[PDB]
Amino acid sequence: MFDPAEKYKMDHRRRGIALIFNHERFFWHLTLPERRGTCADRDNLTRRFSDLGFEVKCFNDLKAEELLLKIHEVSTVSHADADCFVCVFLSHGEGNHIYAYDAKIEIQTLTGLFKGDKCHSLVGKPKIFIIQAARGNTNITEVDAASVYTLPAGADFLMCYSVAEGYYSHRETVNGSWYIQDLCEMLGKYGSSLEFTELLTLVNRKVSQRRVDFCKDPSAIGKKQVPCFASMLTKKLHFFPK
Amino acid sequence: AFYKREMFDPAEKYKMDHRRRGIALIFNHERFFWHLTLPERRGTCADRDNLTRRFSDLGFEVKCFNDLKAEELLLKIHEVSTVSHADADCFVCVFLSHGEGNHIYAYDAKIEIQTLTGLFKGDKCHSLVGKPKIFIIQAARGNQHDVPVIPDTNITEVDAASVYTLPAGADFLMCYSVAEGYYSHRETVNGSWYIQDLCEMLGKYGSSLEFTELLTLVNRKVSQRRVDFCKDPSAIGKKQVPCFASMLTKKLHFFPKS
Numbered sequence: 001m002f003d004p005a006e007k008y009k010m011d012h013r014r015r016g017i018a019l020i021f022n023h024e025r026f027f028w029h030l031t032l033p034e035r036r037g038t039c040a041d042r043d044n045l046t047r048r049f050s051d052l053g054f055e056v057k058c059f060n061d062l063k064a065e066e067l068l069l070k071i072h073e074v075s076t077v078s079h080a081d082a083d084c085f086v087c088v089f090l091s092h093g094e095g096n097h098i099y100a101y102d103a104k105i106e107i108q109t110l111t112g113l114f115k116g117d118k119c120h121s122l123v124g125k126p127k128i129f130i131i132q133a134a135r136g137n138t139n140i141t142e143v144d145a146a147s148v149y150t151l152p153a154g155a156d157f158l159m160c161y162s163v164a165e166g167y168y169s170h171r172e173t174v175n176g177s178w179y180i181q182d183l184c185e186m187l188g189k190y191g192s193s194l195e196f197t198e199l200l201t202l203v204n205r206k207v208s209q210r211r212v213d214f215c216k217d218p219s220a221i222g223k224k225q226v227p228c229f230a231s232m233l234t235k236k237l238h239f240f241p242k
Numbered sequence: 243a244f245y246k247r248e249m250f251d252p253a254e255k256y257k258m259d260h261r262r263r264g265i266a267l268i269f270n271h272e273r274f275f276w277h278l279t280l281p282e283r284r285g286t287c288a289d290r291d292n293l294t295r296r297f298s299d300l301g302f303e304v305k306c307f308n309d310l311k312a313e314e315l316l317l318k319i320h321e322v323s324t325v326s327h328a329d330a331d332c333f334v335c336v337f338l339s340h341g342e343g344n345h346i347y348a349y350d351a352k353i354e355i356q357t358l359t360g361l362f363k364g365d366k367c368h369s370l371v372g373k374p375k376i377f378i379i380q381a382a383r384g385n386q387h388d389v390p391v392i393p394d395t396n397i398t399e400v401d402a403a404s405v406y407t408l409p410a411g412a413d414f415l416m417c418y419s420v421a422e423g424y425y426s427h428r429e430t431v432n433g434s435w436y437i438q439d440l441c442e443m444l445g446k447y448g449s450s451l452e453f454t455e456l457l458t459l460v461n462r463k464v465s466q467r468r469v470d471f472c473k474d475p476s477a478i479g480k481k482q483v484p485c486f487a488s489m490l491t492k493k494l495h496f497f498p499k500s
């Protein structure tokens with residue numbers, strides 16, 4: 001019968017892989033600014049997801065061909081013994097695209113690799129994409145206009161965005177991104193007990209409550225950040241200790 | 243001695259103890275000005291009535307509008323955005339129509355979704371600040387084998403997803419019948435797959451379940467639906483995957499009001 005509280009089965013041998021694509025600088029021809037603070041984000045995420053049982057693999061400043069090769073490689077190995085899959089992008093972006101070192105990649109191309117017909121062993125399992133990407137312009141706060149569309153994907157995907165249309169993404173050059181900081185704080189405290197979209201909702205509250213009435217940089221005043229997640233999940237998702 | 247200090251609470255819920263639940267608007271579009279070259283939407287009136295009963299049972303004041311022109315629709319939604327919602331828990335707005343990109347069709351023209359949600363952001367609607375603003379959108383691509391000229395068996399019509407899964411402001415929840423690359427289904431007597439399943443879940447669980455948890459059940463119900471191969475073989479590969487884009491900041495329940 002229909003169960004209103006059904007949860008994803010998370011009792012496989014492994015939690016699964018968490019991929020992190022970390023982009024700090026870009027080929028000069030793209031004329032994009034460096035992303036100081038992103039290495040703090042990478043380390044923060046690595047610790048949180050490792051603690052949740054994930055096998056975390058980080059890749060710094062891959063070219064687009066290299067990045068596509070790597071994510072395709074992961075999409076074609078067996079996830080039969082895994083609970084789920086996580087993929088994080090830390091970069092600049094525009095519209096449907098995220099930047100690699102030398103060129104843009106379409107988000108739909110990346111998510112498409114993990115759809116049922118392409119990745120059988122993840123069918124019915126959570127596929128979670130976390131995207132910290134917006135428009136490229138001592139602890140300094142950099143402020144970027146939202147630019148990356150809050151795109152959906154297939155069944156059992158969860159697409160998590162640092163910022164919604166009309167708002168602004170913030171990154172501290174020492175402490176890291178507002179969104180990743182608050183995400184990681186919540187993961188550390190509640191990741192192993194709370195339902196994951198409930199947790200992302202806490203992240204929405206934390207980030208949107210950060211004040212922008214008195215910035216060190218006067219030009220940043222009033223540039224609020226509101227994250228968003230787009231859920232195509234079909235069950236409750238927990239990361240209880242394995 | 244106990245009280246809730248202002249510490250971060252992982253279980254915080256929207257306060258839903260106002261005098262009224264709030265207004266639920268339903269914009270119901272069954273047919274369109276001939277110049278738009280859009281097909282009729284048989285079954286949408288079942289959707290409208292279904293939604294009216296479920297949201298009324300949850301305490302909402304439901305107001306339905308059928309086939310408004312774009313000017314009329316904008317006037318009406320602007321009217322609602324400019325009254326005081328001080329005594330309300332929340333606000334619901336439903337669109338049942340065709341759509342394309344960031345647009346929903348009214349009777350005679352397209353309207354941009356951001357124009358509609360924009361009316362309810364921050365100071366434009368102060369009395370809804372910090373309160374859930376829930377938009378439910380059943381809108382996809384009208385099949386246009388259908389002349390540019392001036393014009394009950396249960397059939398399942400299948401429309402490609404066309405409307406962007408747009409976000410909005412803080413405390414908005416944007417609910418979409420279908421995601422990019424999938425297909426929306428509507429039975430000409432029984433109504434839309436998404437609305438049918440939304441309404442069934444509202445009736446069974448609406449008064450207890452956290453609302454995004456309920457929307458997740460709707461995702462499961464809809465994405466598991468299949469058409470019978472005999473009635474329409476051409477619909478075989480056309481799965482429906484709904485989604486919701488949450489900018490909510492707290493848990494949302496619709497417990498019966500005291």
Ligand SMILES: Oc1cc(F)ccc1CNc1ncccc1-c1ncccn1
Binds near residue numbers: 145151165407
């Ligand atoms: O979500 C956003 C985030 C931003 F930073 C800026 C603008 C938008 C709104 N646009 C979209 N949002 C979701 C899905 C598709 C689109 C979309 N797709 C094509 C063209 C326009 N919008």
